[PDB]
Amino acid sequence: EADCGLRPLFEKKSLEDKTERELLESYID
Amino acid sequence: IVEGSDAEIGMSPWQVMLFRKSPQELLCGASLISDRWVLTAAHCLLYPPWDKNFTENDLLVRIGKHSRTRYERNIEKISMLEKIYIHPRYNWRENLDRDIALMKLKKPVAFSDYIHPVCLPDRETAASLLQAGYKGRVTGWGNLKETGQPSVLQVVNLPIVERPVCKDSTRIRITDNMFCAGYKPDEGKRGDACEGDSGGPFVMKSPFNNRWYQMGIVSWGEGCDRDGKYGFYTHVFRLKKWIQKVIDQFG
Amino acid sequence: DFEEIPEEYL
Ligand SMILES: N=C(N)c1ccc(CNC(=O)[C@@H]2CCN2C(=O)[C@H](NCC(=O)O)C2CCCCC2)cc1
Ligand SMILES: *[C@@H]1O[C@H](CO)[C@@H](O[C@@H]2O[C@H](CO)[C@@H](O)[C@H](O)[C@H]2NC(C)=O)[C@H](O)[C@H]1NC(C)=O
Ligand code: NA
Ligand code: NA
Numbered sequence: 001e002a003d004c005g006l007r008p009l010f011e012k013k014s015l016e017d018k019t020e021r022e023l024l025e026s027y028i029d
Numbered sequence: 030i031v032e033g034s035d036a037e038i039g040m041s042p043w044q045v046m047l048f049r050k051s052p053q054e055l056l057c058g059a060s061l062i063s064d065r066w067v068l069t070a071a072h073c074l075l076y077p078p079w080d081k082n083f084t085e086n087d088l089l090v091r092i093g094k095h096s097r098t099r100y101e102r103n104i105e106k107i108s109m110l111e112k113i114y115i116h117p118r119y120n121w122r123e124n125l126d127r128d129i130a131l132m133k134l135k136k137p138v139a140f141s142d143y144i145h146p147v148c149l150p151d152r153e154t155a156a157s158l159l160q161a162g163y164k165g166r167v168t169g170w171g172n173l174k175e176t177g178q179p180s181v182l183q184v185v186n187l188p189i190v191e192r193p194v195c196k197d198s199t200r201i202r203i204t205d206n207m208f209c210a211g212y213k214p215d216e217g218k219r220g221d222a223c224e225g226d227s228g229g230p231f232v233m234k235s236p237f238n239n240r241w242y243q244m245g246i247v248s249w250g251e252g253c254d255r256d257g258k259y260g261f262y263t264h265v266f267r268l269k270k271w272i273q274k275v276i277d278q279f280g
Numbered sequence: 281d282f283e284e285i286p287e288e289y290l
């Protein structure tokens with residue numbers, strides 16, 4: 001779908017979960 | 030999940046629980062990829078060494094769950110299976126090569142705050158995110174330790190490991206249809222999937238479009254969270270052609 | 281140790 005991978009309680013509300021930043025910080029390239 | 034932590038409410042809305050009807054017990058994890066399709070590991074359904082060979086009627090799909098054992102009224106949705114599709118070249122005899130299976134639900138599931146599909150990667154997604162060092166997230170209601178069971182869904186973030194290192198950590202033959210993840214002894218941090226987490230998703234959040242993509246499927250390991258060992262996952266993109274074929278043909 | 285689910289789910 002075009003809405004896949006966007007969580008109602010997080011991305012949809014522009015709220016971040018407690019550890020997703022750890023993932024982002026690992027994506028260096 | 031070993032050395033992980035309690036998941037937040039609605040943190041993994043695509044998380045699916047494969048539930049055995051009788052005896053009522055956790056069968057495996059899985060993921061929601063559309064309103065009628067669920068992705069999981071083939072060994073969750075077919076594994077002769079352990080006399081495992083489930084048919085559609087033997088299990089149920091429980092979506093939107095958080096608590097492991099409780100019936101989450103008004104939150105989770107339970108679905109019946111219309112048909113199971115196991116990769117025709119799944120190798121259960123040796124190394125679980127192509128450990129992947131699809132399950133079509135009898136009725137489409139309604140999305141909610143707790144139920145939502147995860148994206149499947151395309152070639153560029155895979156190329157850009159599947160790099161040693163990059164971290165993914167694994168979730169499940171499996172064992173908390175190798176040798177017990179969580180109250181709620183568990184989560185752990187783990188770095189993808191260099192192929193030579195994956196290869197050098199085991200006597201088992203590794204294929205391009207799998208990748209391993211986990212911390213090294215020197216990295217200090219721990220974490221791993223474990224029995225019961227099989228079929229669950231290994232996801233990554235694209236920094237480009239900020240969507241979650243399922244890059245892997247909890248497949249196998251030797252023990253759980255052991256130093257010098259890593260968890261192995263089915264490479265979802267590598268097998269996307271098969272996924273698309275099944276869905277295009279039967280859905 | 282799983283709580284019973286509604287009978288409607290066979
Ligand atoms: N990432 C992990 N640590 C991990 C994740 C999920 C699982 C559960 N999956 C299974 O039990 C599947 C089907 C057979 N199997 C295994 O993992 C076998 N180890 C059995 C074992 O080590 O208990 C491995 C042994 C080496 C050849 C491939 C099969 C086990 C470990
Ligand atoms: C797994 O279980 C299925 C049952 O769902 C078995 O399927 C049978 O396969 C044989 C071929 O050996 C056919 O003649 C039968 O018609 C199939 N259905 C049944 C009910 O027997 C299957 O053989 C089992 N083992 C494997 C490896 O799939
Ligand atoms: Na080796
Ligand atoms: Na390890």
